[PDB]
Design a protein around this ligand. Structure first.
Ligand SMILES: *[C@@H]1O[C@H](CO)[C@@H](O)[C@H](O)[C@H]1NC(C)=O
Lengths: 97, 49, 98, 155, 49
């Protein structure tokens, strides 16, 4: 809650052009860039991500200018395709949550 | 249990160097451009983009 | 649907939800009235209140709310641009009737 | 007793709107809605964030109705953020508060007063039937909701 | 049911027969919500396992 107070009254008043996403102490947490991105994305301010493993921000509908260098968990399928192909496996049982 | 992992995926400090490396030539390309504007003045002063 | 009617109808939506919960549940939650202490006061959840707040009625009407946050039976009008750049009333929507 | 806070932004008459506030003969159920008339040019999020916490800290309120007279295209998104982080419901009525947006958070008890994206697709084709406009073409751009609009057309 | 037995003795696979649930043959129909199309009857049980 206090993050929103400090973003507007202390950051954008200093002529900020790029913001780097922090890292939560516990990896299970998710709302690390949630309050900053909404305020930063209000004025079309580009934001660069450093510790962002969530694919929620990449839908291009919400968090339009949310850029990151670290792929989220959703890109692991691009290697599952090739690994089973070189291992001569074609029938796969897919279990997801 | 077979799995995969990524290299330098948890060390935040390592990727900060790449964070500023990419923007090195990005700002310069934008620097040599016309009609350069400024960020909004505060949270209550400006409501435009 | 004027703004004073919108506020009057909008107020009735909130009143018919929380107050009516006292009739059956008979326990009004008291959240921490502060800008903080949101996580520790999570025991008094609003899921029970959220169960029946979509179905609201003001002196008789069907104002059910979609889970996506839209009215099931809204009132809509159709407009057409004219010569002098003034939108004019053309049609009216009234409960699946044109 | 539960207080109710309403905030409006724009040009209007404050006394006239509040005149009809104390006119509900609610003897059927003792609702006791403590309506508070709050009006300020709070288009910027800076005014909203300080005021929303001040209202609940000053007066214990469990229901908020929000109206506005602004054409901001991102006011609803940040407004939903307050409702997302809080358990107190808030409703958008007029202005940019009721603009069309795609998805809601599980903790977001936020609702709008506006046409549904799906309904407009069905209403628009319901007029084409009445005038025998049986041939048409569709052009659309990127927006939070364009996909769902097309899905109702083909169905 | 005589043709089926002929295949059983030629490709040494064991079987078991059971009549269709409802009694139709099978076409494509649209469900109430969205434009999802799912089969029905005898045709739609082969694809469902
Ligand atoms: C079919 O299977 C049987 C045993 O299950 C075995 O003798 C052979 O694989 C097949 N029988 C034939 C070809 O006669």
């Amino acid at each position: 809650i206090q993050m929103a107070l400090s973003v507007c009254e202390d950051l954008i008043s200093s002529q900020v052009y790029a913001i780097l996403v922090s890292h939560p102490p516990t990896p299970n947490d998710h709302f690390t860039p949630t309050p900053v991105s909404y305020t930063a994305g209000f004025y079309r301010i580009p934001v660069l991500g450093l510790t962002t493993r969530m694919s929620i921000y990449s839908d291009k509908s919400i968090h339009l200018s949310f850029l990151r260098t670290v792929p989220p968990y959703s890109h692991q399928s691009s290697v599952w395709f090739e690994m089973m192909r070189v291992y001569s496996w074609n029938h796969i049982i897919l279990l997801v949550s | 249990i077979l799995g995969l992992q990524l290299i330098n995926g948890k060390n935040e400090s390592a990727h900060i160097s790449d964070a500023v490396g990419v923007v090195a030539q990005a700002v310069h390309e934008l620097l040599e451009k016309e009609n350069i504007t400024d960020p909004p003045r505060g949270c209550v002063g400006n409501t435009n983009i | 649907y004027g703004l004073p009617a919108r506020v009057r109808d909008g107020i009735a939506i909130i009143t018919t939800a929380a107050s009516d919960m006292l009739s059956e549940h008979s326990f009004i939650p008291e959240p921490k009235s502060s800008c903080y202490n949101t996580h520790e006061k999570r025991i008094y959840q609003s899921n029970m209140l959220n169960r029946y707040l979509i179905n609201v009625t003001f002196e008789g009407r069907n104002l059910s709310f979609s889970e996506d946050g839209y009215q099931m039976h809204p009132k809509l009008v159709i407009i057409l641009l004219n010569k002098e750049r003034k939108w004019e009333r053309v049609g009216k929507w009234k409960d699946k009737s044109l | 007793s539960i207080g109710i806070a309403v905030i409006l932004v724009g040009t209007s008459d404050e006394v006239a709107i509040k005149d009809a506030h104390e006119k509900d003969d609610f003897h059927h159920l003792s609702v006791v809605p403590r309506v508070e008339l709050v009006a300020m040019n709070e288009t910027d999020p800076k005014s909203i964030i300080t005021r929303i916490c001040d209202l609940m800290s000053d007066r214990k309120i469990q229901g908020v109705v929000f109206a506005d007279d602004t054409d901001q295209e991102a006011i609803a998104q940040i407004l939903d953020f307050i409702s997302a982080q809080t358990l107190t419901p808030i409703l958008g009525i007029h202005g940019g508060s009721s603009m069309i947006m795609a998805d809601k958070d599980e903790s977001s008890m936020f609702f709008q007063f506006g046409p549904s994206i799906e309904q407009q697709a069905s209403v628009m084709l319901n007029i084409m039937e009445e005038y025998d406009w049986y041939i048409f073409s569709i052009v659309t751009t990127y927006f939070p909701g364009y996909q769902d609009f097309v899905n109702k057309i083909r169905s | 049911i005589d043709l089926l037995i002929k295949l059983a003795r030629t490709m040494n696979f064991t079987y078991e027969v059971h009549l269709v649930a409802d009694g139709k043959f099978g076409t494509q129909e649209r469900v109430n919500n969205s434009n999802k199309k799912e089969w029905n009857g005898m045709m739609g049980e082969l694809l469902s396992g």
